[PDB]
Design a protein around this motif. Structure first.
Motif, PDB file in Angstrom:
ATOM      1  N   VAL A  48      -4.586   2.053  -1.253  1.00 15.56           N
ATOM      2  CA  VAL A  48      -3.671   1.338  -2.212  1.00 15.56           C
ATOM      3  C   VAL A  48      -4.625   0.926  -3.513  1.00 15.56           C
ATOM      4  N   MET A  49      -5.585   0.410  -3.349  1.00 18.09           N
ATOM      5  CA  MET A  49      -6.479   0.126  -4.519  1.00 18.09           C
ATOM      6  C   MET A  49      -6.542   1.356  -5.647  1.00 18.09           C
ATOM      7  N   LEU A  50      -7.020   2.523  -4.722  1.00 14.10           N
ATOM      8  CA  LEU A  50      -7.118   3.835  -5.606  1.00 14.10           C
ATOM      9  C   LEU A  50      -5.950   4.448  -5.985  1.00 14.10           C
ATOM     10  N   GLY A  51      -4.729   4.040  -5.391  1.00 10.12           N
ATOM     11  CA  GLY A  51      -3.859   5.121  -5.651  1.00 10.12           C
ATOM     12  C   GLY A  51      -3.190   5.164  -7.362  1.00 10.12           C
ATOM     13  N   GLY A  52      -3.360   4.015  -8.123  1.00  6.75           N
ATOM     14  CA  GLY A  52      -2.793   3.903  -9.438  1.00  6.75           C
ATOM     15  C   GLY A  52      -3.905   4.420 -10.272  1.00  6.75           C
ATOM     16  N   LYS A  53      -3.482   4.445 -11.466  1.00 12.76           N
ATOM     17  CA  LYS A  53      -4.513   5.027 -12.412  1.00 12.76           C
ATOM     18  C   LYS A  53      -5.859   4.322 -12.527  1.00 12.76           C
ATOM     19  N   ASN A  54      -5.954   2.880 -12.287  1.00 11.39           N
ATOM     20  CA  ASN A  54      -7.196   2.311 -11.950  1.00 11.39           C
ATOM     21  C   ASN A  54      -7.035   1.301 -10.897  1.00 11.39           C
ATOM     22  N   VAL A  99       0.835  -1.035   0.196  1.00 10.52           N
ATOM     23  CA  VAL A  99       0.021   0.071  -0.071  1.00 10.52           C
ATOM     24  C   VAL A  99       0.757   1.355  -0.092  1.00 10.52           C
ATOM     25  N   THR A 100       1.936   1.278   0.620  1.00  6.85           N
ATOM     26  CA  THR A 100       2.902   2.403   0.458  1.00  6.85           C
ATOM     27  C   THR A 100       3.195   2.690  -0.605  1.00  6.85           C
ATOM     28  N   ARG A 101       3.408   1.497  -1.647  1.00  6.40           N
ATOM     29  CA  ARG A 101       4.023   2.001  -2.959  1.00  6.40           C
ATOM     30  C   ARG A 101       2.902   2.462  -3.700  1.00  6.40           C
ATOM     31  N   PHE A 102       1.597   1.762  -3.363  1.00  7.35           N
ATOM     32  CA  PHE A 102       0.338   1.921  -4.192  1.00  7.35           C
ATOM     33  C   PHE A 102      -0.163   3.670  -4.145  1.00  7.35           C
ATOM     34  N   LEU A 103       0.459   4.148  -2.915  1.00  5.26           N
ATOM     35  CA  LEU A 103       0.026   5.399  -2.585  1.00  5.26           C
ATOM     36  C   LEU A 103       1.209   6.355  -3.083  1.00  5.26           C
ATOM     37  N   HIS A 104       2.358   6.016  -2.726  1.00  7.69           N
ATOM     38  CA  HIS A 104       3.562   7.158  -2.744  1.00  7.69           C
ATOM     39  C   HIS A 104       3.902   7.195  -4.285  1.00  7.69           C
ATOM     40  N   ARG A 105       3.800   6.019  -5.121  1.00  8.78           N
ATOM     41  CA  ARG A 105       4.274   6.314  -6.458  1.00  8.78           C
ATOM     42  C   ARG A 105       3.058   7.062  -7.290  1.00  8.78           C
ATOM     43  N   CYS A 106       1.834   6.940  -6.756  1.00 10.19           N
ATOM     44  CA  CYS A 106       0.681   7.891  -7.307  1.00 10.19           C
ATOM     45  C   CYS A 106       0.874   9.309  -6.853  1.00 10.19           C
ATOM     46  N   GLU A 107       1.184   9.459  -5.745  1.00 13.59           N
ATOM     47  CA  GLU A 107       1.245  10.913  -4.913  1.00 13.59           C
ATOM     48  C   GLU A 107       2.350  11.669  -5.664  1.00 13.59           C
ATOM     49  N   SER A 108       3.489  10.785  -6.048  1.00 12.53           N
ATOM     50  CA  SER A 108       4.575  11.400  -6.668  1.00 12.53           C
ATOM     51  C   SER A 108       4.340  12.420  -7.843  1.00 12.53           C
ATOM     52  N   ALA A 109       3.359  11.962  -8.891  1.00  9.95           N
ATOM     53  CA  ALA A 109       2.934  12.503  -9.827  1.00  9.95           C
ATOM     54  C   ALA A 109       1.722  13.285  -9.624  1.00  9.95           C
ATOM     55  N   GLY A 110       1.064  13.597  -8.479  1.00  9.15           N
ATOM     56  CA  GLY A 110       0.031  14.274  -8.331  1.00  9.15           C
ATOM     57  C   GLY A 110      -1.473  13.516  -8.379  1.00  9.15           C
TER      58      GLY A 110
END
Length: 187
Positions: free
Chosen positions: A119-125, A82-93
């Motif tokens: 975690v689920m909602l971090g990425g583009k889908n 979940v840390t990645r699924f949130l952080h990698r998304c938040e890096s690009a805004g």
């Protein structure tokens, strides 16, 4: 405590990591506490395994389970999904809807479960963050159905019409929200 009952040294990192948290861009600097806690917990579990001789529980410590170490290393490491699924998304805004305290795995049942939705909602889908959502949920052993429903409701408030099908597929695919759950949960 290195000069030493290093109980304070063992416990320090968990509270120190959250010392004055405001964002995740500068996290990668002082977020070494997770690796430190994993390493220390692993050393403690090994030493308890190495404590197969006639060593005593002298007041410098006591005797209890070291499965505390074998799970504190998990508290240090397993959250990375979940840390990645949130952080990698938040890096690009692309990840701005994060709970103000962001209740991590150390939170309560719902608080620890709150990581799965992010975690689920971090990425583009859903197809991007669903794996991390499942990893958090099984790690949390909580109801990812309610968390997925909350994430889908906030995304509907975000007008994610296309993501609705992916959210239903994730609710009824990984094995959490039942095949008949598409009535009340989607509601």
């Amino acid at each position: 405590q290195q000069f030493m009952d290093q109980v304070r040294a063992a416990m320090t990192c968990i509270r120190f990591f959250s010392h004055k948290a405001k964002s995740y861009t500068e996290l990668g600097e002082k977020l070494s506490w997770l690796l430190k806690a994993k390493d220390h917990l692993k050393i403690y579990l090994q030493e308890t395994s190495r404590s197969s001789g006639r060593k005593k529980t002298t007041f410098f410590r006591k005797k209890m389970t070291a499965a505390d170490v074998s799970r504190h290393m998990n508290t240090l490491q397993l959250q990375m999904e979940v840390t990645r699924f949130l952080h990698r998304c938040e890096s690009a805004g692309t990840s701005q809807i994060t709970t103000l305290p962001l209740p991590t795995l150390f939170g309560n049942n719902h608080m620890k479960m709150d990581v799965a939705c992010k975690v689920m909602l971090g990425g583009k889908n859903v197809e991007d963050g669903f794996g991390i959502a499942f990893r958090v949920l099984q790690d949390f052993q909580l109801d990812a159905a309610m968390t997925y429903c909350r994430a889908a409701r906030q995304l509907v408030e975000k007008e994610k019409y296309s993501e609705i099908q992916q959210l239903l597929k994730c609710v009824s695919e990984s094995g959490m929200a039942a095949k008949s759950d598409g009535d009340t949960i989607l509601l």
